[PDB]
Amino acid sequence: NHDNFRRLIKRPHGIILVTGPTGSGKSTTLYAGLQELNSSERNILTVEDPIEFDIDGIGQTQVNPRVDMTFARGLRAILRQDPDVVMVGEIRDLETAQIAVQASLTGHLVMSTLHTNTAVGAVTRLRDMGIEPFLISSSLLGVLAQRLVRTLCPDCKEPYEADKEQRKLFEPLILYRATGCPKCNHKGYRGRTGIHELLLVDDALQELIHSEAGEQAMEKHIRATTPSIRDDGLDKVRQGITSLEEVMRVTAVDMFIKIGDVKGESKDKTHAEEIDVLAWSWGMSQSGSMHMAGKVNVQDLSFTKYIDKSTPNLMMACSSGKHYPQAKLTIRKAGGENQVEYLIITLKEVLVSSVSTGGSGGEDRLTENVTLNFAQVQVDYQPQKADGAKDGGPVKYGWNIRQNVQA
Amino acid sequence: NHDNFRRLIKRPHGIILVTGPTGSGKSTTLYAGLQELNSSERNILTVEDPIEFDIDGIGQTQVNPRVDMTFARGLRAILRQDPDVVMVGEIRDLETAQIAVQASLTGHLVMSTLHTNTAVGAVTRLRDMGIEPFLISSSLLGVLAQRLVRTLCPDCKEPYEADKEQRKLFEPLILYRATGCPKCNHKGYRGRTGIHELLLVDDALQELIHSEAGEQAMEKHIRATTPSIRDDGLDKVRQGITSLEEVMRVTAVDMFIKIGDVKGESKDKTHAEEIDVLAWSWGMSQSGSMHMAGKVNVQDLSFTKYIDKSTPNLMMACSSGKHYPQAKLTIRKAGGENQVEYLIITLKEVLVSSVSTGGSGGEDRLTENVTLNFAQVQVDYQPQKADGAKDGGPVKYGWNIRQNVQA
């Protein structure tokens, strides 16, 4: 986060905003940014209301209402001093933002703040005041959504294993609790630390601002690249700096398959390190007829998957012709890990009959089809009631294909 | 509904509206929400016109016209008191809504009301006053459409079985009637209770507000997730709290198949615990020619179905090659259980010739195709008149395929 912020505040021009609620340590972050830039090779000037403290080596004008010296008039005056970087206390109105946008386009690096709850809230807020949707895309370098969280006192904090609902937010996973004590005096914390979410405007985000995709569409692309405010907080909870209580206050059927001991890349909590199934197909046919006995012909179980770390292992098994002891396809209802696994197809003595892979120039994640030949098969369907609870036990179908008998 | 409302009013920021007509108990619901939040860790302030009653521990300013203290000016003053949560009496005009939208974006949780008949009516109403379509998506957490319904007195209420038109709104289904009596004094009710519809703005609803899908499109997605106002009322009618009269004032061919004694998962009243048929196909061909005899070739009856509790049993029958005594495909006109079963295809000595199952990553309910070989077949079509009544008896077609003769 520092290296990304370093590079951003060291650009020749553009706007960099720091957002969040009151008492989130925005000024402290800006002051630290200006002190880092504070060199003999740059001319740094600021308009503030009021000046928090004095940085030696940097000019700092104060918003004076006695002479009608406002943020807009102060910022308009600073631009005639030949500045390289400018720091505006905050851009409350359109007039001040208009000058800051012009400043950013005219070879100056601008810095300011906005009282918005999210990093998208800052881009939002500029669109609200009346800055043309374009002007934000051209000028804006990035946004820094910041919160402060109280630091658990290291002398008296209580270790505890997290519950299921807590573990779902993030193998003994120990978090830490508040408590209270004489240095603790007598709360669970002493001091503070910042948690961040650095939105960095790249080529993709420059389009979404221009064409007005929207908060949601823009939030979807933002989560693909940048970590959230909560995720940065949860990392500090793992490290043992702040509590989970402190981070939170300031803040289609699923299908898997496990072939032997071959590990995939599933992010599922229960089905971790398995192969994510995108689709599947399997069947059987009886040759016997009632118009006059026959025999069953069980097909190979096909299934689609992403090209993951199991891809070479399945190719090796297909090439060598070595079979796995067991393979278990698991289907599950929509909701999460606690939902009912309503269909589980277990296979025994499993070969990899074929692997079909490839890709196109438009696909972000490439897929491949894999078929599985097997000696035995067991299908376990679990019926459910109207409310979602399990209706009795699971209905079983078992068959030995090698010996042609029930199993 | 309480747990969902709890989590919503305990968010760090956003607008939560309670809507409905006059005398729907909105204030009572807001007051209950503020009392639940009323803690020492939060600063709660309110602007009201007038103040309904005093919550001890919460600040409550009144709209005074003698000093020109309005909702807008009062809300604008409250925001300078460093509040965590704010409750505005109601947002009647644009100016008051503009401040509430800014308040929600600037780290405050806002609460208010709007006189709209539906939960979509609230989102509607904000778009009408002149709030930019976006600003609603970013700020709005949810809407609570609320009505009050009179409670049937438990000492004197009359049990009665509902009629067809009444049963269609929602196996002896008994509802309760008003009546009148000395505690009943002398109406059918004493006291009241609230019925609700909690619209919860999620990622999908954030798009529909942004891109302006519309009331209808938005109402369609809302019915997929959240229960209606009427459904919450009808649940209380089943419980025996209020009458059906009180809730209302404030407010393709069906195909089944039964294979032997194998139970499916049909929710139909007449065809209960049978297999729901999605589609089917069956045919026959005669080799005889008039250009010069031949023989009939009856095909296997294919049909589509969901993956239900019968799936393993059909796979076992296909694998073992054991035939059922009878299998009856039933087609029925659109309407319900009382409609005419206009096509019934009965099969005798039935094998399961094949089973083809599978699924994709987008499907919510997976389907599968099953074919049926049989010795005999009987098709019974029932003709109908223009009004819908049965036109005479059913026309029969019977044939023994094993012996190649009429049946």
From Swiss-Prot, chains A, B:
Disruption phenotype: Deletion mutants show complete loss of protease secretion. Zn(2+) binds at C153, C156, C181, C184. It is found in: Cell inner membrane. ATPase component of the type II secretion system required for the energy-dependent secretion of extracellular factors such as proteases and toxins from the periplasm. Acts as a molecular motor to provide the energy that is required for assembly of the pseudopilus and the extrusion of substrates generated in the cytoplasm. Forms homooligomers; most probably hexamers. Interacts with EpsL/GspL. Belongs to the GSP E family. This is Type II secretion system ATPase E. The lineage of its organism: Bacteria, Pseudomonadati, Pseudomonadota, Gammaproteobacteria, Vibrionales.
